[PDB]
């Protein structure tokens, strides 16, 4: 039996939307991924062990002879010595720091782990930080809120088989984040013709006009949403709603108000 690469997955300040995104993968499906391709050695959302048994499973994985890759979901709350975010009685920052020190690689799934995310939005009561921001280590960022499973599984597979993919300045793989959402939008011709919906109830909205005037952040957002879609069926602009810029750092503060232009 071939040895499968060990993956440790940590949950910090998160909503678990990223975990949920990951399990929507169909190439391959999640079962095939964790039975054939990787060894998911710690994942709080789905693991059988709990309490001390789960904590020992983590310690086992961190001490594995073959090493491990680290996936981090969620930002890190740093106020009060990190005590507003704890697992097994340890601050999340402390556990993420140890786990990162010896990782073969670190993948930040989601805008929260990559850049700080929603809990980092003003006035940031828990003093949340991105993983790279708090620890001072280079990460592979797979942002979005949550990212497309195609982007995450694509990155994970790429990292295990081919090495680190080429990254942009925000640490994002150019394979998935190399193009602006807007550049692949089926409403681009409407945008180029100045055909905008003035409101959601308007005849323009019903005809599928461009959503720029309703705050669409597609023109400043890097992601592959219109190209790959979500759940094999849709994406927000196709659903008549503007892009929020959810794959951009600190979008909660840079892209708001969401229904207005910068």
């Amino acid at each position: 039996a071939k040895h499968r690469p060990s993956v440790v997955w940590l949950h910090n300040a998160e909503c678990t939307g990223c975990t949920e995104a990951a399990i929507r993968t169909i190439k391959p499906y999640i079962d095939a991924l964790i039975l054939d391709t990787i060894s998911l050695d710690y994942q709080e959302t789905i693991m059988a062990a709990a309490g001390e048994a789960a904590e020992a499973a983590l310690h086992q994985a961190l001490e594995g002879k073959d090493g491990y890759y680290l996936v981090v979901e969620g930002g890190l709350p740093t106020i009060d010595g990190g005590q507003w975010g704890m697992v097994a009685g340890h601050p999340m920052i402390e556990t993420t720091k140890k786990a990162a020190a010896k990782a073969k690689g670190i993948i930040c799934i989601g805008t929260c782990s990559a850049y700080g995310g929603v809990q980092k939005a003003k006035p940031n009561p828990s003093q949340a930080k991105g993983v790279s921001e708090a620890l001072g280590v280079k990460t592979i960022n797979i942002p979005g809120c949550p990212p497309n499973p195609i982007n995450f599984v694509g990155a994970v597979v790429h990292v295990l088989t081919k090495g680190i993919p080429d990254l942009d300045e925000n640490g994002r793989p150019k394979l998935f984040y190399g193009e602006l959402v807007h550049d692949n939008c089926p409403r681009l011709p409407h945008f180029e013709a100045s055909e905008f919906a003035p409101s959601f109830d308007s005849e323009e909205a019903k005809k599928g006009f461009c959503l720029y005037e309703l705050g669409c952040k597609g023109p400043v957002t890097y992601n592959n949403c219109p190209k790959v879609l979500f759940n094999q069926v849709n994406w927000p602009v196709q659903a008549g709603h503007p892009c929020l810029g959810c794959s951009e750092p600190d979008f909660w503060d840079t892209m708001t108000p969401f229904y207005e232009q910068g």
Partner: protein
């Protein structure tokens, strides 16, 4: 009899796995039974604080991020909340679209919960390796409708797959499982473990389809993006082909619910009948869902097809109306500044103040929501009892089918077993209504495609949005001032169920459900997990 040790002492389970978020449970055990309990939420993010001063239109996008498991529901509650504050009545099509997406969320949420979060507390996956596939096939044939996935060939393939996995020595998510090497609290014969495991794996594929269905109307999953103030933006979701595809996907999901979920649930419940006498509470609250009139919170409460109501002291003869003025949140045992007790959500205060771990006077990031001084259980069990008491035809039929299958009285539902069964019961009912709901919208959208209403931002106002999310009664409460958010408070189902003690020192539902839990093996306290998981805890939700 129910396996029970003689263990006396404390037990702490941190982390509670197979839930959403970060939960620590502490219990005191005496002669093998839990005598006292504490529910301790371990993460604070502070969405309510973050929302202050922002545009009310932005609320739904922030609040949706309270939770990615119960995705959508907070966007919905926020939209209802703001719709109420600006006094806009959404168009019929928007009501229909919003309710369908909620239905889709119920299907996805309950399926994943039973198989991927809860099942491992009752099913010994490794025992499935001992099963004879032919005998397992023959069993599945007698206990559930015929399907190719339950053939000896299909069950053997699952077993072989699982065997190759276990023999590799890399147990992954099964590492240190409580069932490894056997466990007295695990009752199922190997054949049933094999059946449950096969379905566990099928459910992993099926949940993908349930999410696709939802995305047809919601834009994407997780985190939908189709709701706006005054209705929805998704004109395409009213057209013929997407609605045909939505119906096809939904029917696939409903077939899995009726062929696998319900039969597995009933088979398991049949072996664990003793759990019909463990983990009961007394008070139930629901805001109702699937209303035919969502023009206001009062109309929502009155017209929900899954009815709203309040039951107290297990009295099914007296279902009271929900008094929204009687809801308040205490912080006495929570990590907030002392002095914020008894606040109605319109006057809610969120002032975090941490102390230390296992400080019995302040032990959770959740507030303690109370109703007229009482802790309330919310969720499928609450909805089921409330609907059953009101004689809702679908519930009456599906409950009596379950009670008959198990040969137990309705009072047996006041338990962890009942709480688990109720979750299946309402999934079956949601399934039974999908085709009718879809057809209603298809016809409506074909005739007139109005999806969003005109509205105006008031300078000063307040509003409440109510929903019954998969885990129970959800409410968002907004105060608008100078056209900005002045106060925004979430009171979430998991806050009701898993919050700490209230100002009177009275236990929350989960804390109270834990009292009397037998512990067969203090080293591997699966029984604590069974009861806690039955509430379907979402800590990101509960704390926000």
């Amino acid at each position: 009899p129910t396996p029970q040790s003689t263990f006396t002492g404390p037990i702490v389970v941190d982390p509670i796995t197979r839930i959403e978020g970060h939960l620590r449970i502490m219990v005191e055990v005496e002669n093998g039974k839990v005598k006292d309990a504490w529910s301790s939420s371990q993460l604070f993010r502070g969405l309510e604080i973050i929302l202050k001063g922002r545009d009310p239109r932005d609320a739904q996008h922030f609040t949706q991020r309270a939770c990615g498991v119960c995705t959508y529901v907070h966007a919905l509650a926020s939209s209802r909340c703001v719709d109420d504050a600006v006094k806009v009545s959404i168009p019929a099509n928007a009501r229909m679209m919003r309710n369908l997406v909620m239905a889709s969320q119920y299907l996805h949420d309950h399926l994943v919960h039973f198989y991927h979060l809860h099942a491992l507390d009752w099913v010994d996956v490794t025992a499935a390796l001992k099963a004879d596939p032919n005998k397992a096939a023959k069993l599945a044939a007698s206990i559930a409708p015929a399907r190719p996935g339950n053939s000896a060939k299909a069950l053997k393939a699952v077993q072989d797959k699982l065997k190759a996995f276990v023999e590799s020595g890399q147990l992954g998510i099964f590492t240190n499982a409580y069932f490894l090497g056997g466990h007295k609290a695990y009752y199922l014969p190997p054949e049933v473990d094999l059946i449950a495991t096969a379905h566990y794996l099928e459910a992993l594929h099926m949940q993908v389809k349930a999410a696709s269905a939802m995305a047809i109307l919601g834009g994407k999953n997780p985190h939908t993006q189709f709701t706006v103030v005054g209705g929805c933006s998704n004109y395409q979701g009213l057209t013929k082909d997407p609605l045909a595809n939505y119906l096809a996907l939904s029917k696939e999901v409903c077939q899995f619910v009726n062929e696998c979920y319900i039969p597995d649930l009933l088979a398991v419940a049949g072996f664990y009948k003793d759990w019909g006498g463990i983990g009961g509470t007394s008070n139930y609250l629901a805001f109702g869902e699937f209303a035919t009139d969502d023009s206001s919170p009062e109309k929502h409460l009155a017209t929900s097809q899954f009815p709203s109501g309040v039951i107290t002291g297990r009295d099914l003869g007296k279902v009271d109306n929900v008094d929204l003025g009687a809801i308040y949140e205490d912080v006495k045992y929570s990590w907030y500044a002392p002095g914020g007790d008894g606040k109605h959500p319109y006057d809610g205060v969120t002032d975090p103040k941490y102390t230390k771990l296992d400080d019995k006077d302040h032990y959770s990031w959740m507030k303690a929501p109370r109703y007229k001084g009482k802790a309330m259980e919310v969720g499928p069990l609450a909805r089921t009892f409330i609907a059953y008491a009101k004689g809702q035809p679908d519930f009456k039929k599906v409950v009596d089918m379950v009670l008959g299958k198990l040969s137990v009285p309705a009072t047996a539902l006041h338990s962890t077993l009942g709480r688990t069964a109720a979750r299946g019961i309402e999934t079956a009912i949601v399934c039974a209504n999908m085709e009718k709901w879809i057809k209603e919208m298809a016809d409506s959208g074909a005739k007139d495609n109005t999806l969003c209403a005109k509205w105006e931002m008031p300078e000063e106002s307040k509003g409440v949005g109510l929903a019954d999310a998969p885990r129970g009664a959800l409410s968002h409460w907004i105060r608008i001032k100078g056209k900005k958010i002045d106060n925004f408070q979430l009171v979430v189902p998991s806050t009701w169920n898993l919050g700490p003690r209230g100002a009177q020192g009275d236990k929350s539902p989960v804390e109270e459900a834990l009292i009397g839990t037998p512990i067969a093996d203090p080293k591997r306290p699966v029984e604590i997990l069974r009861t806690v998981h039955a509430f379907d805890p979402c800590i990101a939700c509960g704390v926000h």
